[PDB]
Amino acid sequence: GYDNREIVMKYIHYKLSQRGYEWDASEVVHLTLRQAGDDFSRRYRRDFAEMSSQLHLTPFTARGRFATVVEELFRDGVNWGRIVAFFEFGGVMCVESVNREMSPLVDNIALWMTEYLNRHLHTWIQDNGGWDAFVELYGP
């Protein structure tokens, strides 16, 4: 386990580099989340195909859409699958930001994700075994 900020930073850096974008700022947690995120994306590629246009992302819409989506995602519960979806949704927001010539937003989204993990998911994560539990359920 340890630090949510680093977990976010590493996840976002990886998702962006996959699209060839280099973003200026144990390891088993980072790798496991990468693997899970990639399988999530691989499986539900088609399902979220339209998403980037559904997002309709602008500097004025970004924070509101993030809140709306993340708050609704976890309204009636939390589980590791929903958390992986959360990370993937963030990744999509970042990729779309660069695409819509809003690359500075990437830093804001990383902050929003970090804050949300620290202030709203932290309790559930610790009560359910920490990132160590995630590693055992999802990783090698």
């Binding site: 999530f40 989506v69 993340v70 589980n79 929903r82 992986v84 979806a85 359920l137």
Partner: peptide, 21 residues
Amino acid sequence: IXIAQXLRXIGDXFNXYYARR
């Protein structure tokens, strides 16, 4: 609230696919 409920449905289904034991 689309995107969020259709992430949620699929997150839950995904968390199936990775059910304990």
